[PDB]
Amino acid sequence: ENNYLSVSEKTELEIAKQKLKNSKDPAEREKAQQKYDALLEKDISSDKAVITACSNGQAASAACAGERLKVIAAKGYPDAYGQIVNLLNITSVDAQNQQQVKDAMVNYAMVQFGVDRATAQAYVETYDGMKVVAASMAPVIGAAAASKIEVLAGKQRLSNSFEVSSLPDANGKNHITAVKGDAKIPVDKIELYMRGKASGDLDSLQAEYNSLKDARISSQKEFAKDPNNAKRMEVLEKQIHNIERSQDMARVLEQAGIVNTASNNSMIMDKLLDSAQGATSANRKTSVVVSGPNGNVRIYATWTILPDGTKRLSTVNTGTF
Amino acid sequence: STAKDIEGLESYLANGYVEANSFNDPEDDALECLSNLLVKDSRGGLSFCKKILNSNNIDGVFIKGSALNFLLLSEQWSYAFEYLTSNADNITLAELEKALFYFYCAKNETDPYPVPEGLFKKLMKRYEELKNDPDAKFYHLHETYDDFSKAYP
């Protein structure tokens, strides 16, 4: 049943299944689910035909995802994965295939999450929704193929005169990035931060921060005795401050009529990328003006100059009222 | 392991980022490096609070408030009192709100430190200048100023 797990791994898989079923500790069940999933991935990826199709840089190919699909069918939806596997031959999204990419994402989100068509469409048309959607494919088609699907959906969503692709960072973490010339924008800076979708549970951070704030008000001399107190409060304050600027930026564009659409976000990426072209360490700050039915908004950007001379967007900000 | 934190700081003052391949706001990376240093090594951590509090070549404004706040809550509080007395006309939004907040809390201390003359008027002068900066609300300046004045009428 799990022909490519060692004897030890079969034992661990069974323990994970038991803890998943019997533990009254949600943290222990979450660990057990992760353990079950990691053992299943080792089983599938250790299939001899999966190895042949998925190794030496081919993990994102259609061949690789198709072999993994065959294996998963043998140890058991499959029509949603068929349209998805076919997208893995695509290298660039243009008018020929963009609707093929969109429909496969929509149809998959309906089958996988049980939502109706209109709800699936709204989910896949967002960066954060599409990240959840592609991530949910990884156990079946593999992480590299799921990552490629997220990039493909990004090229379709953000169609304009830049490309979208995935760039590794300092740790091997993928960042979906709009790229043009010698300039780069990690797209979450536009689609999340500029749209008021900064990470962090505002209400959780606010209560942890207000907790420390009252202690400092109650006895500042005592609070100051340990610099850990002021370290935690200042980091909470900054996180809260980033959310509040992120939400205020979103509302500035909102009130101007520049709402959260792919078209608007794509247009913003393209103008920012143009403004960065050929920049130098002399001036690392640029700005563009975008126009909506209710007025204009100036968007300020700061760029990091990378060692190879290209520019990567570091901060994006609007003004306020 | 603090020399790491010091080299992250040195790079922020030099190129405006902690490390090249970090996708964060470099001010946030630097705040972490500064607070990590202050807890592990005060003597060197307060030094970079000064190196931030005088640098006319730092992107972020928040981090200056962080640096000032860290000195006010340290044994070198007096370096911060004398910084606010002379630079009150030049201090940013973040510094002014951290100043107004420190003294609001100091109203509750048993043993408040000796406040230099006219400092409260210099702060209140600076507030009336920065009151109408649209960025004031992100520091909650009008609220912090309300507690500061209702603490010291």
Domain boundaries, chain A: 202-318
Beta bridge partner(s), residue B64 = none
B144: Cβ contacts below 8 Å, ≥ 6 apart = B97, B100, B101, B104
Is B62 within 8 Å of chain A by CB? yes
Q: Are A256 and A292 in contact (CB under 8 A)?
A: yes
Question: Radius of gyration (Cα) for chain B, nearest Å?
Answer: 16
Q: How far apart are CA A69 and CA A183, in angstroms?
A: 38
Is A56 within 8 Å of chain B by CB? no
Q: How far apart are CA B136 and CA B127, in angstroms?
A: 10
- Calculate how close chain B gets to A147, using CA atoms only, in Å: 18
Helix (H, G, I), strand (E, B) or coil at A299: strand
Is B41 within 8 Å of chain A by CB? no
Chain breaks in chain A (C to N over 2.5 A) after: 76
User: Considering only residues 88 to 117 of chain A, which have any Cβ-Cβ distance to chain B shorter than 8 Å?
Assistant: none
Q: Are A150 and A156 in contact (CB under 8 A)?
A: no
Torsion sign, CA atoms A265, A269, A275, A279: positive
Data resolution in angstroms: 2.2
Q: How far apart are CA A100 and CA A83, in angstroms?
A: 8
For residue B137, the one-letter residue type is K
User: The sheet that has A163-168: what strands, in order across it?
Assistant: A163-168, A174-180, A183-186, A311-318, A295-305, A285-292
* Domain boundaries of chain B, sorted by first residue: 1-60, 64-153
Torsion sign, CA atoms A148, A151, A155, A156: positive
- Calculate how close chain B gets to A225, using CA atoms only, in Å: 8
Beta bridge partner(s), residue B123 = none
Interface contact flag, A231 B38, Cβ < 8 Å: yes
Q: Are A281 and A320 in contact (CB under 8 A)?
A: no
Helices (DSSP H) in A25-125: which residue ranges? 26-45, 48-54, 62-74, 78-87, 98-113, 117-124
Containing A291, the helix (H) or strand (E) segment is: strand A285-292
* Pick among B35, B37, B46, B141 to test the A interface (most A CBs inside 10 A): B35
Interface contact flag, B108 A217, Cβ < 8 Å: yes
Q: For residue B129, with 0-12 CB atoms within 10 Å meaning exposed, 13-18 middle and 19 or more buried, which class applies?
A: exposed
Provide the 10 A C-beta neighbour count for residue A73. Answer: 11
B36: Cβ contacts below 8 Å, ≥ 6 apart = A231, B2, B5
Conformation bin of residue A199: beta by default, left when phi > 0, alpha when psi is -120 to 50: beta
Interface contact flag, A234 B105, Cβ < 8 Å: no
